[PDB]
Design a protein around this ligand. Structure first.
Ligand code: MGT
Length: 652
C-alpha cells in the first residue's frame, strides 16, 4: 500500500482551529501542528475507498496552535494563517509547507484569528485580554485595537465590508467593530448570557448569527442592531455554519456532538455514525465534483465528513489523544494492529480494510489511564493483553462487547512489557517498572498472580538480591526467556523452571527492549539471535546458540557482542526483527528517528525522520516487506515505506 498517518486529535475549545478551501484541502490544528488533508477526487483513491488523504503537516509552532484560517480569495487558496500560544501568528504557504511571515504583536495569549474575506492580505487576531491586531502582510502594517477588557472567544470578519468585524466574548457579549474607525463599536448585540462560541455572517445582504454556551442561537439584523429571532437547542460547544447554497438554512452543533440544520422560515433536522461528544468546528468544502461537504471536529477525537445533500456521514478520520506507547500486530488476525495510547484507549486498526484506510475500533471500558503495553495472544483471536501506567494488567476479547478482565494484582509502577509464554495452557507475563515480573493465569485472572522471582531463587543457586527486571522477551520456540535489568544485565533462563544459563553484561544502563529473531528464517543459526536496546544509544546483537546448546551446569557470563549497531544518539525504546528478511532490525530512538539495519553486516539501511518527537515503538507490517509502523510522543503513528526514505543513517 501507500503511506498513512494516524494524526493527533484536533485541539479542543477553539472557535476556529480548522478551515477548508474549495477543490479539496482541509486543515485542522492538532497539538503544535496543523495537519493537511486533501479531500475529493484530487486525493487519488479507489472508487469505494473514502476520498481523503492526509498529505502534510505545517511544522514550526512551539506551543499549542490556537487558531487556523485559510485565505479564501480566488487564486490564493494556498495561503493560511495560524495563531499559537507561543505568541506567534504565522502566514503559511501550503505548497511549500513553510512560513512566509509572522508577527509576535500580541502581549497576551491569543484566542483566535480570521483571514478577511475582502482584503487579500488582512488577518485579524484577538487575544484573551481583548486586544485585537490587524495585520496586512503584503503591505507590512499592523493596527493595534483595544475594544473592551473582556476575554475574546471568537472573531469573524464580515464577508460584505472590509471594515466590519464581529467579536464574541467569554461573558456573552457580542459587538461589531470598524477597523477604519480605529475599533469604534458600531453595534452592541445584547442578549447572550454566557460564552460566545461562533459568529457567522449571513452570506447574502445584513444579518448575523451567534451560538453561545447559554444553549441559544441568535440571528441579528446588523443594521438596526436588534435580535430578530432566537433558537433554543433540544456540556456544549455551539458552533455554526451558514451555507451559501441555502441562505435560509443554518447548521449548528448540539449536545453530544449532534449536528442540526435549522430552517429560518423553530424547525430543525438531524444528521445521520454521529459524533458522540461535543463538536467544535464545522468547515464547508466543495469538491471538484461539485459535492457540498462539511467537515466537523469533535471532542470524541473523530474527524467526520458530511454530505450536505444527504446529511449522512461519508467517512471518519480518527485521531490519537496521547503518546503512541505500543504497537502490536496479531498473528491470528493478520492486519490487526493494536495501539496503546496515552489518552487511555486501545486502538485496534484493521490495516487491511477493503474500503477504508482508517478502520479503527476504540476500547474505552476497563482502561482508565495510559495504556503503555500490549500483547496479542499467539493463538487465540481477539485476545489482547494490555498494561497501564497505574500498574494494571488486563485482558481483552476484541470480538466481544464486554468490559475486560483486570488482574487482581497491580504492579507498583508502570507496566512496560507483556509477553505470553508457557506456564512455569499459556501464561501472561507482565513486567513493571519496580522490577517485578508476574505470571498471570488467563483462565482465572482475578486469582493469585505469582512473582516469578521466587522460582528463579528456588531453581538457581542464589545468595544475593536479584536484579530489578525491566524487560521480558521469550524466544520463538517458547523455551528460553530473557530478562533485561536496570543495571544493564540481560539474563537467559531455560525452559521448565527458569534455570539461569547465561548472563550478558553488555549494556551499562537500563534495558528497554529485547527481541529474538524469528524462526521463519532461511537458516537455523538465526533464531538464536537476540537484539536489545538500553538507555544508551548503541544497540547490541548476541548469538546465544552456543550456550543454549551447551546447556551449562553453572551460568556463563558474556562480555562480547555478536554485532554492534552504533548510529543513534539517544536511548533505544524499541527494536524489531523484520519477518520478511534475515537479520534485519528496525530500532526506535529518543533521537526522533527510526533506523533500519541489516544487523548481520552492521549496515545502516535507512532512517525515518517523519516523526516530530521521541519514538516509543516500531512494528514491521506483517505482509508488506518495505513497510513499517512507528509511534512517538508526538501523538502520531506513521506508516512509512523503507524505499521512500532520503537518509540511510540517523542524524547527529
Ligand atoms: C522507565 N522505562 C522507560 N521505558 C521506555 O521509555 C518509554 C517512556 O517511558 P517513561 O514512562 O517516560 O519512563 P521515563 O524513565 O520517565 O522516561 P524518560 O525518563 O526518558 O522521560 C516507554 O515507551 C518505554 O519503552 C522502559 N521500558 C522498559 N522495558 N522498562 C522500563 O523500566 C522503562
Amino acid at each position: 500500500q501507500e503511506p498513512r498517518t494516524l494524526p493527533p486529535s484536533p485541539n479542543w475549545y477553539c472557535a476556529r482551529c480548522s478551515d477548508a478551501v474549495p477543490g479539496g484541502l482541509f486543515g485542522f490544528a492538532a497539538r503544535t501542528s496543523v495537519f493537511l488533508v486533501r479531500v475529493g477526487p484530487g486525493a487519488g483513491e479507489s472508487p469505494g475507498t473514502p476520498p481523503f488523504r492526509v498529505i502534510g503537516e505545517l511544522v514550526g509552532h512551539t506551543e499549542r496552535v490556537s487558531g487556523f484560517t485559510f485565505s479564501h480569495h480566488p487564486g490564493q487558496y494556498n495561503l493560511c494563517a495560524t495563531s499559537s500560544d507561543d505568541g506567534t501568528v504565522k502566514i503559511w504557504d501550503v505548497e511549500t509547507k513553510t512560513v512566509v511571515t509572522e508577527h509576535a504583536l500580541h502581549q497576551h495569549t491569543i484566542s483566535t484569528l480570521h483571514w478577511s474575506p475582502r482584503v487579500k492580505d488582512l488577518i485579524v487576531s484577538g487575544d484573551e485580554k481583548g486586544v485585537v491586531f490587524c495585520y496586512w502582510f503584503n503591505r507590512n502594517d499592523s493596527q493595534h485595537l483595544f475594544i473592551e477588557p473582556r476575554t475574546i472567544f471568537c472573531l469573524t470578519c464580515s464577508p460584505h465590508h472590509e471594515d466590519l468585524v464581529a467579536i464574541g466574548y467569554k461573558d456573552g457579549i457580542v459587538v461589531i467593530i470598524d477597523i477604519s474607525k480605529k475599533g469604534e463599536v458600531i453595534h452592541r448585540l445584547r442578549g447572550h448570557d454566557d460564552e460566545i462560541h461562533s459568529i457567522a455572517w449571513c452570506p447574502l445582504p445584513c444579518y448575523l448569527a451567534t451560538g453561545s454556551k447559554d444553549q441559544t442561537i441568535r440571528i441579528w439584523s446588523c443594521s438596526r442592531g436588534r435580535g430578530v429571532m432566537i433558537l433554543k437547542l433540544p456540556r456544549l460547544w455551539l458552533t455554526l455554519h451558514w451555507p451559501s447554497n441555502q441562505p435560509t438554512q443554518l447548521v449548528s452543533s448540539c449536545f453530544g456532538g449532534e449536528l442540526l440544520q435549522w430552517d429560518l422560515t423553530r424547525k430543525y433536522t438531524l444528521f445521520s455514525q454521529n459524533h458522540s461528544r461535543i463538536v467544535f468546528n464545522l468547515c464547508p468544502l466543495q469538491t471538484e465534483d461539485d459535492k457540498q461537504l462539511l467537515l466537523s471536529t469533535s471532542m470524541d477525537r473523530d474527524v467526520k465528513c458530511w454530505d450536505i445533500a444527504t446529511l449522512e456521514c461519508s467517512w471518519t478520520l480518527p485521531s490519537l489523544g496521547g503518546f503512541a506507547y505500543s504497537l502490536a500486530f496479531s498473528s491470528v488476525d493478520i492486519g490487526s494492529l493494536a495501539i496503546g495510547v496515552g489518552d487511555g484507549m486501545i486502538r485496534v486498526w484493521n490495516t487491511l480494510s477493503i474500503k477504508n484506510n482508517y478502520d479503527v475500533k476504540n476500547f474505552w471500558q476497563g482502561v482508565k489511564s495510559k495504556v503503555t503495553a500490549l500483547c496479542w495472544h499467539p493463538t487465540k483471536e481477539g485476545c489482547l493483553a494490555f498494561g497501564t501506567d497505574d500498574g494494571k494488567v488486563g485482558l481483552y476479547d476484541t470480538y466481544s462487547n464486554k468490559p475486560p478482565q483486570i488482574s487482581s494484582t497491580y504492579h507498583k509502577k508502570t507496566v512496560y512489557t507483556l509477553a505470553w509464554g508457557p506456564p512455569v495452557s499459556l501464561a501472561l507475563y507482565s513486567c513493571g517498572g519496580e522490577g517485578i515480573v508476574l505470571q498471570h493465569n488467563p483462565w482465572k485472572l482475578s486469582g493469585e498472580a505469582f512473582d516469578i522471582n521466587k522460582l528463579i531463587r528456588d531453581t538457581n543457586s542464589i545468595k544475593y538480591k536479584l536484579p530489578v527486571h525491566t524487560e521480558i522477551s521469550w524466544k520463538a520456540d517458547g523455551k528460553i526467556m530473557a530478562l533485561g535489568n536496570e543495571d544493564g544485565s540481560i539474563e537467559i533462563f531455560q525452559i521448565p523452571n527458569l534455570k539461569l544459563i547465561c548472563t550478558i553484561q553488555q549494556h551499562h544502563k537500563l534495558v528497554n527492549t529485547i527481541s529474538w529473531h524469528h524462526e521463519h528464517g532461511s537458516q537455523p543459526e538465526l533464531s538464536y539471535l537476540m537484539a536489545s536496546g538500553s538507555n544508551n544509544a548503541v544497540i547490541y546483537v548476541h548469538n546465544l546458540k552456543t550456550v543454549i546448546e551447551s546447556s551449562p551446569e553453572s551460568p556463563v557470563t558474556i562480555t562480547e557482542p555478536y554485532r554492534t549497531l552504533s548510529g543513534h544518539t539517544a536511548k533505544i525504546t524499541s527494536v524489531a526483527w523484520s519477518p520478511h528478511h534475515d537479520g534485519r532490525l528496525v530500532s526506535a530512538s529518543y533521537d526522533g528517528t527510526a533506523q533500519v539495519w541489516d544487523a548481520l553486516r552492521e549496515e545502516p539501511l535507512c532512517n525515518f525522520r517523519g516523526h516530530r518527537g521521541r519514538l516509543l515503538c516500531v512494528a514491521w507490517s506483517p505482509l508488506d516487506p518495505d513497510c513499517i509502523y512507528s509511534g512517538a510522543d508526538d501523538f502520531c503513528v506513521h506508516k512509512w515505506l523503507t524505499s521512500m526514505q532520503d537518509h540511510s543513517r540517523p542524524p547527529q
